[PDB]
Design a binder for this molecule. Sequence first.
Ligand SMILES: [Ca+2]
Ligand SMILES: [Zn+2]
Ligand SMILES: [Zn+2]
Ligand SMILES: [Zn+2]
Ligand SMILES: [Zn+2]
Lengths: 156, 161
Amino acid sequence: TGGMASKWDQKGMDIAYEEALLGYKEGGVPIGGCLINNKDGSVLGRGHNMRFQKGSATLHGEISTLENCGRLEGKVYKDTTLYTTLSPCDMCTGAIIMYGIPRCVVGENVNFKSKGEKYLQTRGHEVVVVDDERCKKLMKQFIDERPQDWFEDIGE
Amino acid sequence: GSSMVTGGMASKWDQKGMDIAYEEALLGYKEGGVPIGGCLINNKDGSVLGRGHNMRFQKGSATLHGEISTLENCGRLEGKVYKDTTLYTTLSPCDMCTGAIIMYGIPRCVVGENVNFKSKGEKYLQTRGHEVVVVDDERCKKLMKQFIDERPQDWFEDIGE
Ligand SMILES: [Ca+2]
Ligand SMILES: [Zn+2]
Ligand SMILES: [Zn+2]
Ligand SMILES: [Zn+2]
Ligand SMILES: [Zn+2]
């Protein structure tokens, strides 16, 4: 859309936050997201970090979200928005770029931010940072109680 | 996209790494999937932390490219472990796999070939400081070329086209 928010942006961030909360309850990293079709607002998929739930080194919230959408024709991604509760790392940024997902709406980039947020813009994608305090507070709590687990999720 | 860049020298485990990656690619091909494989080796002692191949068709996966599957197969690891490893891949990494190497801080990426495919990622890796070595493995090129020939529509799906 650019400038003005998409009619589905609040729906998308609320689902992403819902996923992060679910993940937190399961004892995992509280990062969630979903992929929405910009045309009709349909939810193509939703998910959260599965590092602890399935001993996964690649299933970040964004990757899990895309994995849950299943195999899709490349053109489908071209008119979607990926919602994530936290600014994407270099890997998740690469996934957005590879599939050509035009928009990425981020809950917050205070607890974490990689060079990927700017790289997305360099590569022609639109990035929207909401600065959602619900996401920020949830992520901060996890970092406070399990700093080492957070670090593992980003290879630190 | 710099004009004054550099590549890599030569590691003693590179021969072994590309052999494993190729073996993984052949395995994937036999399973009717995209023939792209890889492995991650600890530079400190030559230990194979994991190996894998593309699982798009095997698991209906949109994210399990060869490199991603390889990392997944190493299981959860302490962040510092990746910092002294080399990721081997039969084909030059897309933007997503490039991002994974960058995120985990894997210092070296040895590529089988970049003739059948090459994304902005190969250069971006070097821009981000990673060492990239393209060996131009003929075994890998022949296999991938044949796959692209036989299944153009499946190749494009793997790269979101
Ligand atoms: Ca043909
Ligand atoms: Zn992340
Ligand atoms: Zn990520
Ligand atoms: Zn690839
Ligand atoms: Zn890839």
